[PDB]
Amino acid sequence: PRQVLDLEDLVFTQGSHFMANKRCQLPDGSFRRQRKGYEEVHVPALKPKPFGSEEQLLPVEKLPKYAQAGFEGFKTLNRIQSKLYRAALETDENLLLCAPTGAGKTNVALMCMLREIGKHINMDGTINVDDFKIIYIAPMRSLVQEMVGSFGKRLATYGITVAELTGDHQLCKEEISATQIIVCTPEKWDIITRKGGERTYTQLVRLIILDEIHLLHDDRGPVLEALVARAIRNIEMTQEDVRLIGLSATLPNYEDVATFLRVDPAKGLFYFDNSFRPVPLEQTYVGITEKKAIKRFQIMNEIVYEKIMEHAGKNQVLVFVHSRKETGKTARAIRDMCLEKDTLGLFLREGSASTEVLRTEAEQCKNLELKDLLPYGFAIHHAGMTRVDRTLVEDLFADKHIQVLVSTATLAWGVNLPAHTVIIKGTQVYSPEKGRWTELGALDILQMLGRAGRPQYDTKGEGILITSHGELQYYLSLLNQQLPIESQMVSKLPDMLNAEIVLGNVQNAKDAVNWLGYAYLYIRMLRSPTLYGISHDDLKGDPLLDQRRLDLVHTAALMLDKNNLVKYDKKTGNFQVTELGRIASHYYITNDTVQTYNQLLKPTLSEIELFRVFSLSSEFKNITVREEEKLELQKLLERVPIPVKESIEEPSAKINVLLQAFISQLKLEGFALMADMVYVTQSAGRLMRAIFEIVLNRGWAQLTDKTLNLCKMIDKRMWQSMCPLRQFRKLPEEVVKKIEKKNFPFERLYDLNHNEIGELIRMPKMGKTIHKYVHLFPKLELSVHLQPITRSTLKVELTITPDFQWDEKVHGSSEAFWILVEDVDSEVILHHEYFLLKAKYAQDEHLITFFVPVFEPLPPQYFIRVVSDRWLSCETQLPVSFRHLILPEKYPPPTELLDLQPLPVSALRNSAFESLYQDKFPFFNPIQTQVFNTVYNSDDNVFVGAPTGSGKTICAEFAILRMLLQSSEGRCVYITPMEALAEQVYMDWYEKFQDRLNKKVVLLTGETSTDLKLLGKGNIIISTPEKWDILSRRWKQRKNVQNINLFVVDEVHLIGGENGPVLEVICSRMRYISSQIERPIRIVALSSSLSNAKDVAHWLGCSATSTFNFHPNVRPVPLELHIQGFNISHTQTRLLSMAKPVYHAITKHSPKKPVIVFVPSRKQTRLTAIDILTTCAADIQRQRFLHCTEKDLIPYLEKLSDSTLKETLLNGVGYLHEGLSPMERRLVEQLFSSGAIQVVVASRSLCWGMNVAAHLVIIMDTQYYNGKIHAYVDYPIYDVLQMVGHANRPLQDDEGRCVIMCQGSKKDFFKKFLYEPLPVESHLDHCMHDHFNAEIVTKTIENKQDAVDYLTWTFLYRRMTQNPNYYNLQGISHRHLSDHLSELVEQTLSDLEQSKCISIEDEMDVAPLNLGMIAAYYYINYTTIELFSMSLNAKTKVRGLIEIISNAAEYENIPIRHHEDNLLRQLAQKVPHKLNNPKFNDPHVKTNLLLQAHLSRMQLSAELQSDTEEILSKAIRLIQACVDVLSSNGWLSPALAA
Amino acid sequence: FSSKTEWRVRAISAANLHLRTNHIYVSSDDIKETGYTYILPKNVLKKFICISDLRAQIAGYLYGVSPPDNPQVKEIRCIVMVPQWGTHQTVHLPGQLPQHEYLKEMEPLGWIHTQPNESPQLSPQDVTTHAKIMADNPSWDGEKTIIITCSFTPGSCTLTAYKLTPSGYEWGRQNTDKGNNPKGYLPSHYERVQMLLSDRFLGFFMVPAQSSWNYNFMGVRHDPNMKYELQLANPKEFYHEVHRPSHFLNFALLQEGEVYSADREDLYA
């Protein structure tokens, strides 16, 4: 069905100049006459339409009050504004106002912004700035820059920030976040949308005002086409309405424009033809007819002189030219012609005041050319002359002293000084983009003629247009409402299709056609098929034009696939984004250019080939080297440093030399040559950034360094061999060149004193400034610490320390660096990553942890570089050296899952035992089949390493059954690292054992009083490592802790995590007890597949014939893992961009099966649920995730409290977070398990406490914001493994699919660590003190030799022989091991003695002290009790004792998230006690605030109460410690207060 | 040298040096079979070839060790590049020998230098330079140090190893003529020693700290007695920007510029 079209044939070659109406009818009084070598056509000043019988200029005292303050000094409104103020203020309806240029469209735009602003009034205040944003799209940059000032002045009363969109992507996003009224060009807004920087505030963008929308005819028209299509499609899909205001010129097809804007022909459509122009203009046209350009130019000069003479003594003249030099050239020319003819005085007659003012200002003038003209009535105005001088000219003209301003279009655009008469001279401009002399565009012509007639002084404008005869018709049609607007989207359709695909809006040809329908092109093709290459036959064949749209989509996809920007299949019509396409869309590069780069770029390019490749870009395809400039090009060829392989007659050579000249800062002479220079430089910025991104992604270190240097060099207009002090634009070029002459490395200056540097440069006067600037220069310090993790992966903790004085004026809000880790040859990047240094976090260390692979031929070094992304020569390098690196031994192979037959339930022995396995499964999974003969039939300690969800609990149950068979009065203790998991297992085994086997199971809690009773009573003691350590710390006293028989430890692979050392110490203590207590405490360990399982087996007493380490590919249900990279450094932007991919993955992988999506935090859950539902609704498959019917939801939806949760569950989506009550959690879990709801969005912290398994597991953004360090720390691999293991449905699902969407930085880390088994290490060295003091008071440790012996039991000691470098060790030798053990133990003992928790005598014996006994008694941190004993005096009180408690080191882990500071600040002002110097980032002040809030029983947020409960959990033990320490001290009143 | 466009043509030629790095020939002839054997890592070899020039010779010190339980073979584990400027037939290295902490574990093994074209004998210049270095520095044992010559043959680099005999050492230490054919130079002064490549281990480079290595364009700034501190990094290219500051720095500034430049708004930025 699809057919390939000829896109370039379909396009309009003239673009902006293309003509659509073959005829051009002129008004009644529009005579014409052939004067001489030219034709003079006239058109009279249109008579204004008589005021309607019931229409008037209503004063500003009638519009709403909130809109009055925006109109300052304005008494009545123009006719147009008075007509449509009701539409622009009272309704949110899309508008299409067609008004003449210079009729006051900006005031209508202000009316619409005032409506959007009055929607937010903040009654007591003035405005709620941070709740809305308004986009104002104006076409020219100068126009944007002047609208910014105008609207800022107008709206200053509201405090609304009006800003232009400029700068790098980070600067633009910060600007958006900081401001409200975003003024921008179509290209700028399109590029920010493509890059996604505004994704965080598009929701708050409540209005877009497309000003001067006749740009749709221009080659820039596709930009507005894409903007409006995207805005409308987002409105329709996401349903968040955004109001479109189209301010357009009076031209045809405005009905189609309104259709394209979704504007009602009745309400939102108006038409104010040129009759309504506030200052009607008599427009005359002089079409020169001769066919020789020399005579054409001479006639042009004569005609401009004649027209100047026409109004010489009557009115002011604004002559418009194309070039800055041509400005002064023609101004001096006309001055000389009037001088020759003796008509010079007509302009400046004896107006003594005006003439003397002009003469004085001239004699004050610093511009020589303008000084030459100011004495007379002539003046020049171009951007290339001083700001002071151009404002001088502007104010002089406003004072009417000057009579003839010669200017280019920038004045007419960016400054509103309207003159009585305007004279456009020639209308021919050298376009480098087309590489030839072309014609003025409609937008520029309209703006330049808009100034014709000052509304204040002028009663009739006079616009002369001196053109060529053939082109006369084009401008006549443009200016007589006869230039119909026509889409140019066929020129750039592949680019827009690629942009949409990259943004993810369109995925397959169907969605692509759906988007294409909205575009303005669609309406044009529908209305007029012939003009767009379509036959009425085709139109009748496809009334909606679906076939033609599909053909266009097919052609665009074919181009994109051929250039490799998209992976397009002709079978299903689906699109897949390529990284090349991502870069192309983000940097607006053309598909031909990106293909050229993909074909040419190689790892081995040099700085000579780089320039050639850049020059060969298709963007310059039109640029052709002309002979007239060849001699100057040769001069530049001789002077440019980088040799040119090409021959100077190639356009590629031309671009090469032009770019080198720009960078070298040389000055050129030929106007066309400077035009080409400007064009190529402005293109080169983006082009070189794109090439740098390509090479960075492909991992070529040398070439990426070269290209980044070249990008920064172009930006800073300086070769990188220069003095880096030029980058400070405030410094004198003379002093920077003196420094350059005294050539020494820049770093030499840092160590010196300001006088020292001043005398080195021989500039003592500058010395202080140079010192300030050199110290302002950015600089970083790197400190690396590396630990081998396995034989093929290291871990590098890199600390970054700023070494410069931050200064907002030069640096700004942030500084961007690139961290590159590359191999010995520095030819392949192993790890590249961004790094943002925000101003808030300067002068402090930043940790950056990453995993870098190490290959077989162990290289001598790797290199880590940090290079600024903006500054030149701001680099720092550090060689990481593998000279003393000891790689752990390669781990042994897993115990292969021998192909045993399915183990039948009869294999078990006891009938009562089988009773609880009969009806659940008739056979045990192969893992249990294999492990049974070792667990049930054998007695030695057993290790079972199987992937999560492999039923390790059933093997543990076999062990319990074996113990019970040995004796019914045995005792099994089931240790589980997480309390939620402990609760789950307690329920499972209470239903399994106690209810059926009548065997007691007791779950210990944090109460030592009842824990002993439960242990002595029950037979299956569920415990957590800490709740059991509080018991085993006195195991000698507790016989119930001694006469155990079975010790089951659950997922010991959680030994190497936070709180893991507690589990490790209790397990090692049990091993030692067993060794001493005359009867082995047989141990059964369950884990995920562990690479280093042999060591743990040896530590725990296992045998090599009882170690069962399987592989992650041994799970009963196979797993399909998919990791999606999202290279978005910003975290919120990545989070919001992942939303649509979640829905796409749900559709692709599990369309009709359970899905669980794990989100980072407590707030992201609701947003993710709402977003998935919104996208499913945008697609026609609404409520598709509700496998049940709403009839079955009311009984459960009536139990919930969260109304939004009720809404999502009604639509078919549930969500879970800690803030929810257990009732709600269990209810949604029950619904999901039953299958009523398909999608469940759960918090990250909940991955452990979940009684549900789904077919599909999606993981979001595997990082979370730790506010203590204000950094996004990665997910622990234990938690991630738990999340992926939740994708375990044994019988319902043949496979389990899990998709993790993670940053490209962590992509490789997850790819590595999620497929292979999991190595585990010990972290006891850092949390050693607590348990060591506990054992000291228990008297297990009595001398440092016994301390070393005690350490010889810990799992730590085992790993200090296989992976020593992990523990700062330098050798596995006995000497090294003993020395490290002695150093560690001595350090810990010394620290404890300083805390006074122990006493060391003879430096060899340890004895307990009161602080140590109390800390071990109530399980407090030795540091916390030290702080308590020191801070607690005889005269403390509750007011201060609460503070002392809040300073306890048991609260350092209270979560500090984002948005948590402002409400904490609010809380600080209400609690009974005030806090001194409260830094709300501090967990201790936070904990004090929440303690006071709990005591005062005030209302708290759900998330804050979540942490309040955690605080109160340990608060009781902390205050008990307070009481006991004050008891020891002997302070009655403080003890009473405690 | 012409120094006007000859450097341009030579830079263009040097831009293609990486093609030579896959056609390497080792001259295994006249080897005495009795001395040490030497093993050169291909990564450092290829980097050295790439960073060189076709006309002006470059040279760098070799450092290496012996593998365990095999002292008659020597692995070259490091190459040091020092501030130098050379001509088409000699290299003017500084008197100071390399000194750094990492080098303290390796024993100097000689130097390696490029040659514009292959020759069948060790040149008087190379022998005299080797003898002078050995005499000045006691650590340079005359039985383990060697000279490695890389000759740019048509589309290839031919590597040959030479060892200095005691007679050649005396003649070099006494000689003072720097001409192409000094008196008393005989083919008995040198002998060929076995050298071979290896893909089994990787060596590294050491370049100066404060400055770069190539001074050919900054000839005046170089002195034989110049002192220099080393640094663990990788070398730049002969024609790198840093090595020819004159071409990039001798330009002029902008004064009253951009006044008559074209008007083109950068709409996208």
Q: Tell me the three-class secondary structure of A829-876, residue by residue.
A: EEEEEEEEEEHHHCCCCEEEEECCECCCCCCCEEEEEEEECCCCCCEE
**CA nearest A1133: which of A181, A202, A163?**
A202
3 state SS of A1215: strand
Looking at chain A, which residue has its C-alpha nearest residue B269?
A: A166
Chain A residues within an 8 Å CB radius of B249: 719, 721-722, 740, 743
Structure tokens at B77: 């584990």
Chain B residues closer than 8 Å to A409 by CB: 263
Q: What distance in Å separates the CA atoms of residue A1227 and residue A1236, rounded to the nearest whole number?
A: 11
In A, which residues are within 8 Å of B203 by CB distance?
A: 860
- Residue ranges with strand state E in A304-361: 317-320
Nearest-by-CA chain A residue for B232: A879
- Cα B101 to Cα A88, A1058, B106, B230: the distances in Å are 77, 40, 10, 10
CB A518 within 8 A of CB A232: yes
* CA-wise closest residue to B74 among B162, B196, B205: B196
Whether residues A385 and B259 touch (CB distance < 8 A) is answered with yes
Which residues numbered 78-97 in B keep a CB inside 8 Å of some CB on A? none
Shortest CA gap A866–chain B (Å): 15
Please indicate if any CB of chain A lies within 8 Å of the CB of B233: yes
A4 CA to centre of own chain: 38
Task: Determine which helix (DSSP H) or strand (DSSP E) holds A1407, and give its type and residue range.
Answer: strand A1405-1408
E runs forming strands in A491-592: 566-568, 575-577
Beta-bridge mates of residue B112: B60, B148
CB of B79 closer than 8 Å to CB of B235: no
Technique used by the depositors: cryo-EM
- A720 at the B interface (CB within 8 A)? yes
d(CA A1348, CA A1332): 11
Contact call for A384 and B245, based on CB within 8 A: no
Half-sphere exposure of residue A80: CA atoms within 13 angstroms, side-chain side: 30
Counting runs of H as helices and runs of E as strands, what totals does chain A give?
60, 44
Residues of A in contact with B65 (CB under 8 A): none
**Contact across the interface for B259 and A220, Cβ inside 8 Å:** no
Burial of A1210 (0-12, 13-18, 19+ CB in 10 A): middle
Run of H or E including A1198: none
Place of tokens 């000829």: A6
* Alpha-carbon A1457 to chain mean position: 18
Closest CA to A176 of A209, A142, A144, A135: A135
* B47 contacts chain A (CB < 8 A): yes
Around A1304, how many Cα atoms within 13 Å sit in the side-chain half-sphere? 14
- Reference A322, options A390, A383, A387, A251; nearest CA is A383
Maximal C-alpha separation, chain B? 77
* CA within 13 Å, CB half, A484: 16
What residues contact residue A882 under an 8 Å CB cut-off, 6+ apart?
A854, A858, A859, A860, A861, A862
- Interface touch B262/A430, C-beta < 8 Å: yes
Strands (E), A1288-1347: 1296-1302
In this structure, what token pair is assigned to residue A2?
């699809």
> Tokens in use for A1016?
């002595």
Are A308 and A58 within 8 A, CB to CB?
no
Question: At B79, which helix (H) or strand (E)?
Answer: strand B73-80
Non-local (6+) Cβ contacts of A108 within 8 A are A80, A81, A84, A88, A97, A99, A245, A247
Q: Is A721 on the interface with B (CB under 8 A)?
A: yes
Is A608 at the interface with chain B, CB within 8 A? yes
Which residues from chain B sit within 8 angstroms of residue A186, using beta carbons?
Answer: 267
- Distance from C-alpha of A90 to C-alpha of A102, rounded to nearest angstrom: 24
Task: Give, rounded to a whole angstrom, the gap between the first and last alpha carbons of chain B.
Answer: 46
Residues A396/A361, Cβ–Cβ less than 8 Å: yes
- Half-sphere exposure for A165 (CA within 13 Å, toward CB): 32
Task: Point out the residue among A410, A666, A859 whose CB comes nearest to the CB of B263.
Answer: A410
CB A685 to CB B234 under 8 A? no
Q: Residue A720 is nearest to which of B18, B204, B241, comparing CB atoms?
A: B241
B203 close contact with A: CB closer than 8 A: yes
Q: Do A588 and B268 make contact, defined as CB atoms within 8 angstroms?
A: yes
Cα separations in angstroms, A551 against A10, A439, A513, A522, A1085: 13, 33, 9, 13, 63
Query: Which runs of E-coded beta strand occur in A1307-1370?
Result: none
Minimal Cα–Cα distance from B182 to chain A, Å? 39
Nearest chain A residue to B46 by CA distance is A825
Q: B262 and A881: CB-CB below 8 Å? A: no
What is the spatial distance between Cα A593 and Cα A589, in angstroms, rounded to a whole number?
Answer: 7
Alpha carbon of residue A546 to chain centroid: 36
- Total count of residues recorded for chain B: 269
Q: Which helix (H) or strand (E) holds A257?
A: helix A254-260
β-pair type (A378-381, A923-924): unpaired
Which of B205, B263, B264 best probes binding to A when mutated, by most A CB atoms within 10 angstroms?
B263
Residue B200: how many other CB atoms lie within 10 Å: 9
In what helix (H) or strand (E) does residue A482 lie, and over which residues does it extend?
none
Distances (CA, A) of A808 to A285, A812, A813, A1130, A1337: 54, 4, 6, 21, 56
Q: How far is residue B25 CA from its own chain's centroid?
A: 18
Angle between helix A1203-1211 and helix A1222-1234 axes, rounded to 10 deg: 0
Bridge partners, B194 (sequence order): B37
Residue A736 to chain B, least CA–CA distance (Å): 11
> Could you tell me if A134 and A116 are in contact, meaning their C-beta atoms sit under 8 angstroms apart?
yes
What distance in Å separates the CA atoms of residue A1265 and residue A1279, rounded to the nearest whole number?
16
* DSSP tag of A1163: T
Report the distance separating Cα A1035 and Cα B189, nearest Å: 83
| One-letter amino acid of A356 | E
Residue A746 contacts B, CB cutoff 8 Å: no
Is A952 annotated among the ligand-binding residues?
A: yes
Do the bridges between strand A575-577 and strand A780-788 make them parallel or antiparallel, or are there none, so unpaired?
unpaired
Residues of A in contact with B245 (CB under 8 A): 721, 743
Check if the beta carbon of residue A1119 is closer than 8 Å to that of residue A1281.
no
Task: Tell me, yes or no, if B19 comes closer than 8 A to chain A by beta carbon.
Answer: no
CB nearest to A166's CB, from B9, B202, B269: B269
Chain B CB within 8 Å of residue A860 CB:
yes
Using CB atoms, pick whichever of B248, B252, B257 lies closest to residue A719: B248
Contact criterion met (CB below 8 Å) for B189 and B168:
yes
Q: Residue A210: helix, strand or coil by DSSP?
A: strand
CB A384 to CB B269 under 8 A?
no
Question: Pseudo-torsion of CA A1525, A1530, A1531, A1537, nearest 10°?
Answer: 40
Taking the Cβ of residue B101 and every Cβ of chain A, the question of whether any pair is shorter than 8 Å is answered with no
Q: What is the Cα A497 distance to its own chain's centre?
A: 23
Q: Is B267 on the interface with A (CB under 8 A)?
A: yes
Helix (H, G, I), strand (E, B) or coil at A336: helix
